Amino acid sequence: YFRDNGKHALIIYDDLSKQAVAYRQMSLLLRRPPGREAYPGDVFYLHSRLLERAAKMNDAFGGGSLTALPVIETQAGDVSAYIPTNVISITDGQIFLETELFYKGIRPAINVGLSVSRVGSAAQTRAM
Amino acid sequence: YFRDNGKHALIIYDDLSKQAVAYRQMSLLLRRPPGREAYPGDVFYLHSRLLERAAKMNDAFGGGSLTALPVIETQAGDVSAYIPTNVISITDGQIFLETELFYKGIRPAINVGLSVSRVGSAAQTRAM
Amino acid sequence: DLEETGRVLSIGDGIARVHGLRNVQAEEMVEFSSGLKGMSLNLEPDNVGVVVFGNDKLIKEGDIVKRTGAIVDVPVGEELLGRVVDALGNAIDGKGPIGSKARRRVGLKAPGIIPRISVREPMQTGIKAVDSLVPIGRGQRELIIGDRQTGKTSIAIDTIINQKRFNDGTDEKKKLYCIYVAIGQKRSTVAQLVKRLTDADAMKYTIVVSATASDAAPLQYLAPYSGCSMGEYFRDNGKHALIIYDDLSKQAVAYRQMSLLLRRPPGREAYPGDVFYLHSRLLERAAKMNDAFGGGSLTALPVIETQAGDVSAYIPTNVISITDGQIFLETELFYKGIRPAINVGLSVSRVGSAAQTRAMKQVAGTMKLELAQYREVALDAATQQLLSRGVRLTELLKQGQYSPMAIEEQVAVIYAGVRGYLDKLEPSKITKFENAFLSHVISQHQALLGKIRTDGKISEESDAKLKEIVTNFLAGFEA
Amino acid sequence: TTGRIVAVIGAVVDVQFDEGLPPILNALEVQGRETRLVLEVAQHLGESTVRTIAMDGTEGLVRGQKVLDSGAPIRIPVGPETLGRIMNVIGEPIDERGPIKTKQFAAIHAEAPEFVEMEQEILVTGIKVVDLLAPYAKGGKIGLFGGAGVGKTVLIMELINNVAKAHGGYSVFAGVGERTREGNDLYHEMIESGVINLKDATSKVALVYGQMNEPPGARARVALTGLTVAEYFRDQEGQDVLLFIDNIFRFTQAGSEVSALLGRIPSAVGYQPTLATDMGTMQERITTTKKGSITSVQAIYVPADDLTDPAPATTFAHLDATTVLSRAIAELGIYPAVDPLDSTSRIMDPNIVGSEHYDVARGVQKILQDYKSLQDIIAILGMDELSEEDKLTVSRARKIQRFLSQPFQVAEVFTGHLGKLVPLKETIKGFQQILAGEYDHLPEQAFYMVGPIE
Amino acid sequence: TTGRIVAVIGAVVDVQFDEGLPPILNALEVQGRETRLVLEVAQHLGESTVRTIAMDGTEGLVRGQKVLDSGAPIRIPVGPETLGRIMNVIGEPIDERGPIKTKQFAAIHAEAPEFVEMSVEQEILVTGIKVVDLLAPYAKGGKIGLFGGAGVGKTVLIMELINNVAKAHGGYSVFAGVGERTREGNDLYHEMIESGVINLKDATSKVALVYGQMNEPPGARARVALTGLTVAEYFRDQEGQDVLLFIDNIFRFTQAGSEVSALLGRIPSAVGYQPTLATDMGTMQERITTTKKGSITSVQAIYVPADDLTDPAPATTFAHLDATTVLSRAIAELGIYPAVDPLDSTSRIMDPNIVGSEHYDVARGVQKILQDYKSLQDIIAILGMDELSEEDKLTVSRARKIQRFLSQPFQVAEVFTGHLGKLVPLKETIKGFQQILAGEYDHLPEQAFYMVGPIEEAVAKADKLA
Amino acid sequence: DPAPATTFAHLDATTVLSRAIAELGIYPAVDPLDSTSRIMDPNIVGSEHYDVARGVQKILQDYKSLQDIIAILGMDELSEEDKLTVSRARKIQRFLSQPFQVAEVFTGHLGKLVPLKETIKGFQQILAGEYDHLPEQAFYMVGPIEEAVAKADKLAE
Amino acid sequence: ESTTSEQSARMTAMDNASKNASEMIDKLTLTFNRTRQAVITKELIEIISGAAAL
Ligand SMILES: Nc1ncnc2c1ncn2[C@@H]1O[C@H](COP(=O)(O)OP(=O)(O)O)[C@@H](O)[C@H]1O
Ligand SMILES: Nc1ncnc2c1ncn2[C@@H]1O[C@H](COP(=O)(O)OP(=O)(O)O)[C@@H](O)[C@H]1O
Ligand SMILES: Nc1ncnc2c1ncn2[C@@H]1O[C@H](COP(=O)(O)OP(=O)(O)O)[C@@H](O)[C@H]1O
Ligand code: ALF
Ligand SMILES: [Mg+2]
Ligand SMILES: [Mg+2]
Ligand SMILES: [Mg+2]
């Protein structure tokens, strides 16, 4: 609604890991075929169509925008587990948090040598 | 029969690993669908209902008892595997034996830190 | 007629279910109207399940299916020589019909215990490191194993090129007909291989069976059994054939695809429980026949591709447990310039020592011991000497591609090294030394070489002679 | 013929026909929808019903809804009119510039050239690090490796930009799992640099997008659509075409998702049982025929960084070379972020590229792997314990490092600096020198982010 | 009574009978075949149909093809007329020498010997192989299992045992080749004819051969071990005399069972195996046994898939044994042969009241020093022995010498070791390890204890090395 | 595992126990680097409590990251600061153990209950270096810090 | 003489240590990829086995 009317919205999805668990429950109980970790073959598409709705509109369309910050919970640091791999590949970048950094006193616990932003400088002010 | 008649009995189950394996055969052949590690999803209940029957009775029930020493065979020393922890999670303690101690001449080959008794000194004379 | 023909009930997942075919035999070839062939796999009370040897989109529900009356078989004979065929035996090289006059079942059981004898005639690869240290005999099964890009195929191709000396010779018993089965490889690669064989003039005695990466899985699964039956034709008629399966890793992947589509229970790495047997029945058919069965043979060199040098994985170990040894190739050896990249210590020929010429025997023995002692040490003059010989010997085992060497030349070369004529040389100069010496003995000392070749040994005289030649060559050696 | 939908389960639709069933791989058109909805037949279930995979969403479908058999597999527009346009998997324009008026159409499913229907050459990129150390060969498949956000796509863009020369300069870009934001950015850059001309017919690249938010059957088939566009150029007009596939991992995963949806049992590590034949049927079509050739650059995602994972492992059987980008290199400021010590070619040798080129390349790896040794000691013991000799290897090396850096035309929107296209000639030359020392006094800047040695 | 095939899938054939169903385990005969084709009843499906397993290939079978019930399970020739012969899974001669004219026949299926028939006598069987006799000694009439990954040395070890124990053994031997190389069956047969252990002219042969190798379909590999053991039972009992039974390789029985379990309709268990893996194994293994009537000394090679000793097949086999010899690829790659893991080979007979306190104390001391060393290795992995402490330096040097003195050149491996074979007597194996542990050779180089026989040979080799 | 991984989102505080800690005889076997609470915030428990708890976590995480270099390059190869991380972390590990009253049948020790202020103080004093002179075993299985100073005297004979 | 003997020995020692380590990294890396692959495969076979058994 804000995106399409010349305004700017920020959405946080906290979290998508749980949303995929709910979808899996339905898929398995309707007896659709289970894949890796028992997720169905369209769980990638469940997230990809949700996240491609975030966008920056052109002037003809009002200049508005919708920014998304999905949250994924990993297990024991596994960023190559199914649902995480899917949401990492879909997004424009990722902010990786790590428990070892956190208890060492690095808080926020961001691994800046591994975090990604393909947009980068294009979204910064000149002094920053 | 002893337990309920004022007497005391000691039972050894040697071993419960082989019993779980026979239970998994029967169950798969009855076409009950397997759970983890291809064992029936109630492999814990197989052993918990059995081991619960070892008990100490009060005086009104004649004061007899039944003491059990079930045996589980681990693989490559993995004491924290699924079947092994299921049984640990049932008994009032475990005696864990390790091959490296056995060959070092530490026999009985008891790993002290990983072995416990859940009755403790309540089961020892004052002198011990 | 539902006895001799039937109609497709369903198709997808690679199995065609067929109504009718009441008289079909288990394992019979059936024909679809489109022209594709299939094998009757499952006979059930209300259908026949058929494996399709090609693309199943060319099959639709209602399509007519007809018996052939014959258990799956392929054309065989000397007509297949110099040709390139698919897994069913059809020509794919554009040179016309195969003029074959006989056929043979792809699934024939291997020879039993009685018709055999232990291997005893050399299967010469022309590769110094193999012919000396991992000798292969006619009838033997010797696995070629190692990671991608280690030179596995190249060993095979040089072996095939090597046979021209015998095949263009008189002595028919020394001849060796070759079969190269390409399984899951790229088309362009097979085409490049055929051109190479053609330029080396080795195609005239080779059959190429191809089921490449875009061919349907069942053809890739079948190809090895087909080539094997083409090789058996020589084995049983007093002749000798050599078959290369390049490779069985891809054949087991094609088989796992078919099995999973058939819903067979996946095991280790999701392979079906009969994946060992897939290979075992195939390789048992390479054998050496005693004289009462004509004295012929079928030698096999199956190829297995490892992942990061892990020879303890399921398929590798399966195949190691079927063959009579193996030639292990390693990436580290390759990168360092140890080419061919053969790990000597880990490689083995379980039955080939009995089939190595005495001549090679009288020099490979000491090189084996000398490399055995070296392998320990890689100051102190003694261990330091071992080091020296080991470094020179290793240089001698290096060899380029496409120039498989006659055995008497290999001996002449190994001789220089184990007799010490190379010690006072720069490690860097052995190769140049070896080429110059070989052109020399080849030009100026044919007779001596002809001798070693003919006698099959190095006489007391040939040894004294050779001592002189090498000596007088090392003096004038300029490098 | 016209059939009826009998089942809808997400992206799988079962369709029943009274007469004549559409063979496997045929395209069915659903009737009564605002936008075209294609179903690809995957199986014949028996009882006259076909199981299909949808190429777009299936919400709103009703049991009983009519469906026409196109009488063929998915067909798309092929010809020069595809140049400068953006197309989806079923060949429809998605750039909003109206119809794609070609004179022909082509099936996206096609057998590879037969055994009889098929030497080595070299494809000049104008990118010094590649043309020097790991040059591409026309007709081959090149894997492009690199962590997220390192520059793979930017590199794809420069390659499309530089190719506009010798053997022609036509390109097809297939975006498998294309992120919509990026498909907008790639389009705008192609227009900006001129490779796409919205005014005339000089466009040199056709774009085919299989977007992330599309169903699995659309993402699995878009590489084939892209491949079909290219086959026209090679076959009907005798060209040496370039096919960009970004990313091939998502071709594999889309195939693994379709297999799972059809209820097939997964293979090792969760991949489809048909992993190798799926890869095989696509790749084999990428080859040199007498009529010409198709060279392919394929961005490859490596799961968990395990090169033995089945997906990269199967893909590698089809590659002739690689281009390996590196984050550690990008973060220290060098673009393109190529690791000069990890790129190779199934065919880079003096017999092929010629002593000169060869020696220049190989001379650069020794200096680099030599400078790498001295790094510890320089940092720890100080950049002084170095002998006059070793001290020399360092300055030469550091100088070569930056000469490997290059400002890209398509990178102008980022750095604001001009881009440079460097001829093999000017590349080979400049690197041959370094050793010499003609630049020892020359500082490490007339070397960083420059084109020609001069 | 006759039936008709209603279904065929590989080795599994369904057969419908209009009158009299054949009971489970009966052997049925397929009509219209060039060579005898047996179907063993496995199940009653209902509707007068039974499910069976073929003993040979099913290519060429047609639905409706006729089948007769033989009225009993597979029965084979047993007795003195099997000696010197080669039979297959259904008891047919596969040596081209004509019929096997015995007086007796025996079913290949039979109930195991009951608890009351068990014998409890334990006596050592000396092999002359140092590592086996010292650490995990074999018992006469006992069960011996040789575990090993592909190509690590199980067959070579079997052949050395035949050569050190059998050849000069009172009674008869049975060798059952199960799922291995036919050419190894041709090698064995020829070698026994060359030595006279098999005589094609007299009645003096001492071994009966039974084969069903890796060229056979699964039903034949799943039953061929029963054929071999049936021959051995007869000599055990029906003569009461001490037989040697060699099986190479019993894992192939369990592997063949997993190929058909799928065709039989079962839900798979762990690793894709048959759910019945352990009870199938048990019903076969419990017949391979010494009883009060007579003794069987059985030696079974046990393949280990992907080198994983925890795979359900090798793992379930451990309980069926009295002595285990475990071979390791890592050890083989260090050039130590036989490639026996001295800390994973065990014996129920390694008790001081049986082998005496000196054998027992030396074996326990060798194992303690080798485990102590293994434990140091784990902590030296990166920093070598320098950082190590001189006394630990002494555990290392001794353990290294002991590991090499466990190596030994076998008569059947001379081609690979380039060393003549050696047989070391029990008392000398004990003395030599006793001496090393006492420090008597702390001044000899390691290399001297490698590939020799008795300890006097290490000493010599030491001088030679100088 | 799915059961416990799904339970975390329902809690406000978690106490995670570990067999690897139990095995060393450290009871209660609480993993101090995986036990969390919604009220562990300086504005709720105050900055002193908050700062000591984070300093205890930091030293325990730094010790954990060094253990596998100590074991390989030896303690002597460690900096002096790294040596203090080690001795103090190992003392803090033992001070987190405690004799429970319901666990006397298992420890052979009388149970102890330690007031919040005494807990904060004891750990702040160890981190500050006040007890670098006492042996490790003094902080094992006691209640208040005064009890460790007294055990150190006892052990010193 | 001692310093030259000391430094010569330390080099050689860290050299072996450095080679031992790289070998430990290869066994571990390969252990890691094989285990990661087997966990996914194994978990999936348990899912399918339970699914098909209904
Ligand atoms: N002896 C050799 N000397 C030089 N190059 C070699 C040699 N053997 C093989 N190669 C080259 O190594 C590459 C890999 O060889 P190939 O036989 O295809 O390995 P694989 O079949 O194991 O993948 C090929 O380009 C081949 O030409
Ligand atoms: N050659 C380059 N010059 C400057 N910036 C670059 C270059 N390549 C990449 N970048 C920066 O990195 C970002 C991500 O690049 P991209 O090609 O999308 O990475 P990848 O495809 O590897 O994920 C770009 O948007 C830009 O900010
Ligand atoms: N005792 C041994 N001494 C030397 N080499 C041996 C020995 N045992 C095995 N080997 C080597 O291993 C090869 C395979 O051994 P074998 O017993 O046949 O394997 P398997 O365990 O598969 O039965 C032998 O041919 C030989 O080269
Ligand atoms: F050859 Al084997 F077990 F590998 F007998
Ligand atoms: Mg190859
Ligand atoms: Mg990108
Ligand atoms: Mg063997």
CATH code of the domain covering residue C60: 2.40.30.20
- A-chain residue closest to G40, CA distance: A36
CB E72 within 8 A of CB E10: no
Residues in contact with ligand 1 (CB, 6 Å cut-off):
C 148-154, 339-340, 399-401
Residue D296: both structure tokens together: 């392919």
- C391 CB-near residues (< 8 Å, 6+ apart): C374, C427
Indicate whether residue D153 lines ligand 2 (CB < 6 A): yes
Question: Domain check: are C221 and C78 in the same one?
Answer: yes
What technique solved it? X-ray
CB F98 within 8 A of CB F27: yes
Q: Do C38 and C180 have their domain in common? A: no
On whether both C235 and C249 belong to a single domain, the answer is yes
Using the 3D structure, point to which of C41, C70, C99 is the last residue of a domain: C70
Q: What amino acid positions of A are annotated as catalytic residues?
A: 118
Which residues does E4 contact at the CB level (< 8 Å), separation at least 6?
A: E15, E16, E63, E64, E65, E66, E67
Q: Atom 23 of ligand 2 has which residue's CA nearest to it?
A: D149
- Do C269 and C227 belong to one domain? yes
The answer to whether residues C22 and C94 belong to one domain is no
The reply to whether residue E276 touches residue B22, judged by beta carbons under 8 angstroms, is no
Exposure string over E305-344, b if 16+ CB within 10 A, otherwise e: bbbbbebbbbbbbeebbbbbbbbbbebbeebbbbbbbbbb
Of residues C314, E330, C310, the one with CA closest to residue G29: C310
The alpha-carbon gap from G17 to the nearest alpha carbon of chain E, in Å, equals 5
Beta-strand pair E207-212/E27-30: unpaired
> Residue A117 forms beta bridges with which residues?
A93
> Are the C-beta atoms of residues F30 and F15 closer than 8 Å to each other?
yes
Cβ–Cβ < 8 Å for C147, C306: yes
End position of a domain, from candidates C356, C387, C417 = C356
Chain-chain contact of B34 with G50 (C-beta, under 8 angstroms): yes
Max CA pair span of chain D: 88
Rounded to whole angstroms, the Cα distance separating D317 from D336 reads 26
Which residue has its alpha carbon closest to ligand 4 atom 1?
A: C321
Using alpha carbons, list the distances in angstroms from residue C91 to C28, C37, C180. Answer: 22, 15, 15
Do C350 and C242 belong to one domain?
yes
Distance CA D349, CA C179 (A): 31
CA E393/CA F41 separation, integer angstroms: 54
Q: Are residues C93 and C9 in the same domain?
A: no
D26-30/C206-211 β-pairing = unpaired
In this complex, does chain F touch chain A, defined as having at least 3 beta-carbon pairs under 8 Å apart?
yes
Cα of C213 vs centre of ligand 5, distance in Å, is 13
Residue of A83, A98, A103 to mutate when probing chain F, most F C-beta within 10 A: A103
Pairing of strands E207-212, E104-107: unpaired
DSSP 3-state assignment of B53? coil
Measured distance CA(C413)–CA(C435) in Å, rounded = 9
* Nearest residue by C-alpha to atom 19 in ligand 3: E151
- Residue E213 DSSP class: -
Q: How far is CA D239 from CA D76, D166, D175, in A?
A: 19, 11, 22
φ, ψ for residue D134, nearest 5 deg:
-155, 70
Show the tokens assigned to C327: 């030639």
Structure tokens at C160: 């095939």
**CA E180 to ligand 4 center in whole angstroms:** 8
What angle, rounded to 10 degrees, do the helices at F145-155 and F116-128 form?
60
D444 contacts: CB under 8 Å, gap ≥ 6: D395, D398, D399, D402
Same domain, C142 and C167: yes
**Which residue among D185, D297, D414 has the greatest number of ligand 2 atoms within 8 angstroms of its CB, and so is best to mutate?**
D414
Q: Does C251 share its domain with C372? A: no
Q: CA-CA distance, E63 to E48, in Å (whole number)?
A: 16
* Cα–Cα nearest to C184, from C219, C216, C224, C213: C213
Residues D395, D401: Cα–Cα separation, whole Å: 10
Angle at F30 between CA F24 and CA F31, to 5 degrees: 90
Interchain CB distance below 8 Å, F71 and E379: yes
Of A118, A119, A121, A124, the residue with max ligand 2 atoms within 8 A of its CB, to mutate for a pocket test, comes to: A118
Torsion sign across C-alpha atoms E15, E19, E22, E28: negative
Are C190 and C315 contained in the same domain? yes
E169 C-beta neighbours (distance < 10 Å), count: 15
Distance of CA D359 to the CA centre of its chain: 29
What is the rounded distance in angstroms from the CA atom of residue B20 to the CA atom of residue B33? 15
Helix, strand counts (H, E) of chain G: 1, 0
| CB atoms closer than 10 angstroms to residue D376 | 9
- E272–chain C Cβ distance below 8 A for any pair: yes
Residue E151 among known ligand-binding residues: yes
Q: Which of B15, B25, B27, B78 to mutate to test the interface with E (most CBs of E within 10 A)?
A: B25
Token pair of E204 as six digits? 């003096």
The pair of structure tokens assigned to C106 is: 């792809």
User: Which residue has 């330091």 as its token pair?
Assistant: C384
- Whether residue C453 sits in one domain with residue C363: yes
Residues D160 and D297: their CA atoms lie apart, in Å, by 10
Q: Name the residue among B24, C266, B89, B47 with its Cα closest to residue E316.
A: B24
The answer, for C111 touching chain E at a CB cutoff of 8 Å, is yes
State residue C444 phi and psi, 5-degree precision.
-90, 0
Nearest residue in chain F measured CA to CA from E383: F72
d(CA A88, CA D147): 12
Neighbours of C242 (CB within 10 A): 28
Residue type, F137: Q
> CA geometry: angle at D130 spanning D127 and D135, to 5°?
120
Of C11, C46, C70, which residue sits at a domain end?
C70
Chain center to CA of A46: 12
Q: Does F61 touch chain A (CB under 8 A)?
A: yes
Mutate to test the interface with E, among B18, B103, B104 (most CBs of E within 10 A): B103
How would you classify residue C249: left for phi > 0, otherwise alpha for psi between -120 and 50, otherwise beta?
A: alpha
CB contact under 8 A, E387 and F74: yes
Q: Packing angle between helix D355-381 and helix D424-433, nearest 10 degrees?
A: 50
Cα–Cα distance for residue pair D142/D120, rounded to 1 Å: 14
Tell which one of D152, D154, D300 to mutate to probe ligand 2, the residue whose CB is within 8 A of the most ligand atoms. D154
Q: Phi first, then psi: give them for residue F66, nearest 5 degrees.
A: -100, -20
Protein residue with its CA nearest to atom 17 in ligand 1: C151
Three-state SS at C93: coil
Chains A and C touch, using 3 or more CB pairs below 8 Å:
no
- Can you say whether residue C79 is alpha, beta or left, with left for phi > 0 and alpha for psi between -120 and 50 degrees? alpha
Cα distances (angstroms) measured from residue E137 to each of B77, B117, C277, C469, E157: 25, 37, 35, 58, 14
Buried (b) or exposed (e) across D381-418, using 16+ Cβ within 10 A?
A: eeeeebeeeeeebbbbbebbbbbbbbbbbbbeeeeeee
* Partner residues linked to D142 by β-bridges: D297, D321
**Is the distance from CB of C232 to CB of C216 less than 8 angstroms?**
no
Neighbours of C472 (CB within 10 A): 11
**Which residue intervals of F8-144 are DSSP H helices?**
19-22, 42-45, 47-73, 80-95, 104-107, 116-128
**Residue D266 and residue A35: Cα distance in Å, rounded?**
7
Phi, psi values for residue E36, rounded to 5°: -55, 130
Say how many C-beta atoms besides its own lie within 10 A of residue G18's C-beta.
Answer: 11
- Judged by 3 or more CB pairs under 8 A, whether D touches F is no
Break positions in chain C: residue before each gap, C to N over 2.5 angstroms: 378
Of D141, D143, D165, the C-alpha closest to D152 is D143
> Residue C408 sits in which domain range?
357-478
Q: What angle is formed at CA E337 by the lines to CA E334 and CA E340, rounded to 5 degrees? A: 95
Q: Whose CA is closest to D211, among A55, A61, A96?
A: A55
Q: Residues for chain C: how many in total?
A: 479
For residues C82 and C177, what is the distance between their CA atoms, to the nearest angstrom? 10
Q: After which residues is chain A broken (C to N over 2.5 A)?
A: none
Cβ neighbors of E256 (< 8 A, separation 6 or more) are E179, E218, E219, E220, E221, E222
C372 and C470 co-located in one domain = yes
Contacting residues for E51 by C-beta, under 8 A, at least 6 apart: E12, E13, E14, E41, E42, E43, E44, E45, E264, E265
CA dist C466 → C370, C416, C433, C470, E179 (Å)? 21, 9, 16, 6, 49
CA-CA distance, C401 to E38, in Å (whole number)? 53
The SS3 call for residue E177 is strand
For residue E353, the cross-strand partners are none
Domain architecture of chain E: domains with CATH: 1-73 (2.40.10.170), 74-349 (3.40.50.300), 350-466 (1.10.1140.10)
Neighbours of A44 (CB within 10 A): 29
Q: CA nearest E107: which of E226, E275, E279?
A: E226
DSSP-based three-state secondary structure for C288: strand
Structural domain total, chain C? 3
